Design a protein around this ligand. Structure first.
Ligand SMILES: [Ca+2]
Ligand SMILES: [Cl-]
Lengths: 496, 18
């Protein structure tokens, strides 16, 4: 459950948030495969409540109606086709498994669902699964409101309704089998693994009991005996009874400390400086690298009120965001997930965005196609951070430098830092308000290297800055604080 | 319930707190 099951030399996955299945499948073939991406995290593929107040919010997809693969992203045929086409070009599919809960208890009974299945939250009846009142935690939850009130009670966090979402009884073999039936259906279709949504709200033993029911991966695309990649969403910044290490036996865990700390450091908040990133990794109190799923932002916290609050960097802070992602992709700690978002009319009142519920770009609730501009950016309000040259090239950087040790660190005691990855790559950062002009040991073979942040290596020449490494491995770097991207990254495959 | 552990964004939380 720790191995991503990616192809050799593909070290990152991208969260194609609210993307349609056919758009993802085409994206696998036209972009993700040639650009070296390892896999894709898909929005929950199972039927959810259609919520019209507010109008089709993104978070409606975390309120399951049933386990039918039938959503605003596509039907089972489109999903099967996406998984097949992606695997055939070497890009994996990881399913956001919403297994902790059904929809909210106060949702109106009826057929207002993405596949028209009937469901009655009031009576705990989901006949499309089927689930009944026996399959929920009404009895086990000891709290007055039936919801999660006190996060310092680990039992209530697990046994009660997350923001009123009906909490399944994962101790029962019947509930474990229906979830495993659903997950095994996705494994048989060919998915490489799962993001376990709201893992903090499930007991680790219940997770283990479910995972033990899972098949090995589809042998058409995976070696015999391959297990599904498991990364569990557990928000743990410390100081709470639930520790993300409690889930190490089931798979990797989302390290929400990663993006929280990295954002504060790069915003230069709270006296933090980039020079403190020298011991980045376990040194900062993070989970072991082999247990870590890392990211700058996720679909939730990029709206400002998730784990890490205002410190989370997003595409809205594009310049600072690119630096954080570049550092993450350059540093060997953890398995990196790149965020790919859509635009929404962010409207702040008292520092709170009242439109952070807005779902993907749509035409009367129908998600818009992802269109590609001639400059390779996206239209139809899709941000496609994964297609940004500065981020995409760093995804490749991580592939090129895979396995090479963190070495050759430099810092100025402030915010001008650099490091290398063995003899395969070097990266330099200037987050101070003055120029970075210095000659640094890169550890790279002598040659002319294309800076993959400001440009590309195309036809034996660079479209951006050129770095000249001498025979001693030294190279001079000159980065203005007014530079569009105040960081430079070179690697073995950007050498002319 | 409070404002400590917000999930699904601010707008969802405000409607949940009500
Ligand atoms: Ca639970
Ligand atoms: Cl996550």
């Amino acid at each position: 459950q720790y191995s991503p099951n990616t192809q050799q030399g593909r070290t990152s996955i991208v969260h194609l948030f609210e993307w349609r299945w056919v758009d993802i499948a085409l994206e696998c073939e036209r972009y993700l495969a040639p650009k070296g991406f390892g896999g894709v995290q898909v929005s929950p593929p199972n039927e959810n409540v259609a919520i019209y107040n507010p109008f089709r919010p993104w978070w409606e997809r975390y309120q399951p109606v049933s386990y039918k693969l039938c959503t605003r992203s596509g039907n089972e045929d489109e999903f099967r086709n996406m998984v097949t086409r992606c695997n055939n070009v070497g890009v994996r599919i990881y399913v956001d498994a919403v297994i902790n809960h059904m929809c909210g208890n106060a949702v109106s009974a009826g057929t207002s669902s993405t596949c028209g299945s009937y469901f009655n939250p009031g009576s705990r009846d989901f006949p499309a699964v089927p689930y009944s009142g026996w399959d929920f935690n009404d009895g086990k939850c000891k709290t007055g409101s039936g919801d999660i009130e006190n996060y310092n009670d680990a039992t209530q966090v697990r046994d009660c309704r997350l923001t009123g979402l009906l909490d399944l009884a994962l101790e029962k073999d019947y509930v474990r089998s229906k979830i495993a039936e659903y997950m095994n259906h996705l494994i048989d279709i060919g998915v490489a693994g799962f993001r376990l949504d709201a893992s903090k709200h499930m007991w680790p033993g219940d997770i283990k009991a479910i995972l033990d029911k899972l098949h090995n991966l589809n042998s058409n695309w995976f070696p015999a005996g391959s297990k599904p990649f498991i990364y569990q969403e557990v928000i743990d910044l410390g100081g709470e009874p639930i520790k993300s290490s409690d889930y190490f036996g089931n798979g990797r865990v989302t390290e929400f400390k990663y993006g929280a700390k990295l954002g504060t450091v790069i915003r230069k908040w709270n006296g933090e400086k980039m020079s403190y990133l020298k011991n980045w990794g376990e040194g900062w109190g993070f989970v072991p690298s082999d247990r870590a799923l890392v990211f700058v932002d996720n679909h939730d916290n990029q709206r400002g009120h998730g784990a890490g609050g205002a410190s989370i960097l997003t595409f809205w802070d594009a310049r600072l965001y690119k630096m954080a992602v570049g550092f993450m992709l350059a540093h060997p700690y953890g398995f990196t997930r790149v965020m790919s978002s859509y635009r929404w009319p962010r409207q702040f009142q008292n520092g709170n965005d009242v439109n952070d519920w807005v779902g993907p770009p749509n035409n009367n609730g129908v998600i818009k196609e992802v269109t590609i501009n001639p400059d390779t950016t996206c239209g139809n309000d899709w941000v496609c951070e994964h297609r940004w040259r500065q981020i995409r090239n760093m995804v490749i950087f991580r592939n090129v430098v895979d396995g090479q040790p963190f070495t050759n660190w430099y810092d100025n005691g402030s915010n001008q830092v650099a490091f290398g990855r063995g003899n395969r790559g070097f990266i330099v950062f200037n987050n101070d308000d003055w120029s970075f002009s210095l000659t640094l040991q890169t550890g790279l073979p002598a040659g002319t290297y294309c800076d993959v942040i400001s440009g590309d290596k195309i036809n034996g020449n660079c479209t951006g800055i050129k770095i000249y490494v001498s025979d001693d491995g030294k190279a001079h770097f000159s980065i203005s604080n007014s530079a569009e991207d105040p960081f430079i990254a070179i690697h073995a495959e950007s050498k002319l | 319930y409070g404002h400590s552990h917000i999930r699904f964004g601010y707008s969802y939380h405000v409607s949940y707190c009500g």
